[PDB]
């Protein structure tokens, strides 16, 4: 997840006379040099946006250097990676590190640590690209480092799911929060439509959970079209459409929600059922509809980002075949 | 006094200290005593009696006068 975070810092101004000739430009350049490309305060900082507040260029009191410091408050574009987050492109660097190490080549620099105890790895040699699912271990943003540090497993579609029992209604402020979230998903869906469709079909079939879902049947461009395939059980609902009509304040959400593995993960579809008709291996969780919509919406966000980056990085069929030892492995573990 | 006293002397080298030393800590600021509000310095011993001898009216020789050459030599 990329985002914007407001930071606070104190600079050191070696030449206050030359610095003040253009305060804002020099301040922005100093901030960009210092903080871009390095994680700082539990965020990665991809790009420095203009400053919000700053102090007058003071003079260093406790030394005869004559330099100034000046305090700066600024906002920056930060990439924060979470648990269960989906990363679609990871390069293996070394096999001598038997614990297995990788380096993500997406827009968010992360160095991944895929444990070798699981047998689904140690099959990927050095130089090939394979996606990773981030485990529940928290991404470590050690300050000053050029990239995030995290541990995660090679993605298997994980045919498990969670049912959600709602007991609180949405308010208009929460409605606006999830409407910003669906704005994000609309951007992602437009990006998906902009790609060469057959690659999304292939990657979606590969990471679909239950069965191979027969054949090419039921085109799945998804964008502005609630089309889908498989159709295992129960009538689904469009979480997006539920959102906009909830923004119109019609529908209540006081029900049981789930996205079982039979659904297409990148689709905005889900099931709203009144009395828990799902075959859950877990107890329903009793909490508010803001939690449910946040969780499902960001699940869709990371699944669709996953497929988008997989389609983007695999622009040609030769690269897929170069990493052939992963595709048949995942097809084995369906 | 000069009976064997030793006093420390350090020369500032930093620009901030050098600017400070001449502007703030110069001895001209300690001419007037902070303690007593009066002057600290003046003539002592050789000059306190020297000022009296110079400015007294009559010497044992006569009137306390000097010719031009010795008046010039005082300066
Ligand atoms: Mg003495």
If you measure from the C-alpha of residue A149 to the centroid of ligand 1, how many angstroms do you get, rounded to a whole number?
71
Tell me the shortest Cα–Cα distance from B17 to chain A, in angstroms: 8
The method recorded for this entry reads: cryo-EM
Q: What is the DSSP letter of A309?
A: H
Cα diameter, chain B:
59
Based on its alpha-carbon atoms, the radius of gyration of chain B, rounded to whole angstroms, reads 20
Mutation site for B-interface testing, chosen from A60, A63, A64, A67 by largest number of B Cβ within 10 Å: A64
Residue A276: left if φ>0, alpha if ψ -120 to 50, beta else—which one?
left
Ligand 1 centre from A62 Cα, in Å? Answer: 37
Cα–chain-centroid distance for residue B38? Answer: 15
Cβ pair A212, A205 in contact under 8 A: yes
Q: Phi/psi at B69 (nearest 5 deg)? A: -65, -40
Q: How far is the CA of B39 from the centre of ligand 1 (A)?
A: 22
A64 contact residues in B (CB cutoff 8 A): 14-17
Backbone torsion region of residue A282, taken as left when φ is above 0, otherwise alpha when ψ lies between -120 and 50, otherwise beta: beta
∠ CA A274-A276-A282, nearest 5°, is: 145
The alpha carbon torsion through A154, A156, A160, A165 (nearest 10 deg) reads 60
Where do the H-state alpha helices sit in chain A? Answer: 16-19, 23-35, 172-193, 197-206, 239-247, 289-313, 317-322, 324-332
**Token pair for A101:** 């190490």
* CA end-to-end distance (rounded Å), chain A: 28
Q: Is A8 exposed, middle or buried (0-12, 13-18, 19+ CB in 10 A)?
A: exposed
Closest chain A residue to B13, measured at CA: A64
Asked if the Cβ–Cβ distance from B17 to A66 is below 8 Å, we say no
Q: Find, in chain A, the residue whose alpha carbon is nearest to that of B16.
A: A64
Chain A residue numbers touching B15 (CB-CB < 8 A): 64, 66
Q: What are phi and psi of B30, to 5 degrees?
A: -100, 15
Q: What is the DSSP string of chain B?
A: --SS---------SHHHHHHHHHTS-GGGGSB-TTTSSB-----TTTHHHHHHHH-SB-SSSB----HHHHHHT-
In angstroms, the CA A7 to CA B10 distance is 46
What strands lie across the sheet with A132-134, from one edge to the other? Answer: A86-87, A132-134, A148-154, A110-113, A101-104, A90-94
Q: Which residues of B touch A67 (CB under 8 A)?
A: none
Beta-bridge mates of residue B17: none
Instruction: Give the pair of three-digit tokens for residue B43.
Output: 């003539």
For B20, name the nearest residue in chain A, comparing CA atoms only: A64
Chain B: residue whose CA lies nearest to A62: B16
Using a CB–CB cut-off of 8 Å, the residues of B that contact A are 14-17
Residues of A in contact with B17 (CB under 8 A): 64
Cα separation, A254 vs A274, in Å, equals: 8
Encoding tokens for residue B63?
């009137």
Q: Which residues of A are less than 8 Å from B16 in CB distance?
A: 64, 66
Contact A39, A141 (CB under 8 A): yes
Distance to chain A for B15, nearest Cα, Å:
8
HSE (side-chain half, CA atoms, 13 Å) at A143? 5
Q: What is the resolution of this structure in A?
A: 2.8
What strands lie across the sheet with A256-258, from one edge to the other? A237-238, A269-273, A256-258, A163-166, A285-287
d(CA A73, CA A35): 13
DSSP letters, A182-248, are: HHHHHHHHHHHHTS-HHHHHHHHHHT-SSS--SSS-S----TT----S---SS--EEHHHHHHHHHT
For residue A122, how many C-alpha atoms fall within 13 Å in the half-sphere facing its CB?
Answer: 9
As beta bridge partners, residue B32 has: B39
Residues paired with residue A163 on neighbouring β-strands, in sequence order: A258
A18: closest CA of chain B, how far (Å): 19
**Selection from A213, A229, A196 nearest residue A308 by Cα:** A196
């Amino acid at each position: 997840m990329i985002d914007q975070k407001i930071f606070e810092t104190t600079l050191n101004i070696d030449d206050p006379t030359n610095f003040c000739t253009n305060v804002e430009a020099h301040l922005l350049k100093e901030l960009e040099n210092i903080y871009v490309g390095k994680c700082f305060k539990n965020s990665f900082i991809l790009n420095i946006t203009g400053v919000i507040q700053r102090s007058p260029c003071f003079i260093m009191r406790t030394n005869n250097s004559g330099r100034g410091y000046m305090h700066v408050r600024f906002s920056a574009v930060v990439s924060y990676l979470n648990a269960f987050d989906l990363i679609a492109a990871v390069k293996i660097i070394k096999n001598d590190s038997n614990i297995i190490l990788g380096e993500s080549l997406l827009t968010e620099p992360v160095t991944i640590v895929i444990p070798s105890s699981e047998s689904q790895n140690n099959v990927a040699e050095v130089g090939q690209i394979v996606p990773v699912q981030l485990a529940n271990s928290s991404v470590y943003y050690i300050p000053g480092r050029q990239q995030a540090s995290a541990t995660g497993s090679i993605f298997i579609p994980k045919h498990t799911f969670s049912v959600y029992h709602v007991q609180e209604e949405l308010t208009q402020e929460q409605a606006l929060n999830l409407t910003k979230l669906v704005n994000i998903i609309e951007m992602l869906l437009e990006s998906r439509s902009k790609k060469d469709f057959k690659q999304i079909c292939f990657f979606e079939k590969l990471y679909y959970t239950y069965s191979i879902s027969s054949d090419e049947i039921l085109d799945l461009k998804i964008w502005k079209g609630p089309k889908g395939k498989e159709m295992s059980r129960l009538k689904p609902c469009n979480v997006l459409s539920f959102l906009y009509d909830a923004l119109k304040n019609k529908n209540s959400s006081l029900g049981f929600w789930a996205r079982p593995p039979n659904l297409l993960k990148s689709s905005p579809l889900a099931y709203q059922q009144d009395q828990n008709s799902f075959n859950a291996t877990e107890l329903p969780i009793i909490c508010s509809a803001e939690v449910m919509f946040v969780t499902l919406l960001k699940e869709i966000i990371n699944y669709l980002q996953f497929i988008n980056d997989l389609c983007d990085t695999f622009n040609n069929e030769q690269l897929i075949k170069r990493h052939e030892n992963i595709w048949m492995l995942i097809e084995q573990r369906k | 006094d000069f009976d064997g006293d030793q006093m420390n002397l350090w020369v500032p080298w930093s620009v901030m200290s050098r600017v400070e030393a001449e502007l703030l800590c110069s001895v001209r600021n300690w001419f007037i005593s902070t303690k007593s509000s009066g002057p600290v310095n003046g003539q002592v011993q050789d000059s306190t009696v020297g000022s009296f001898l110079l400015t007294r009216t009559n010497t044992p020789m006569g009137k306390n006068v000097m010719n031009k050459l010795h008046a010039m030599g005082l300066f």
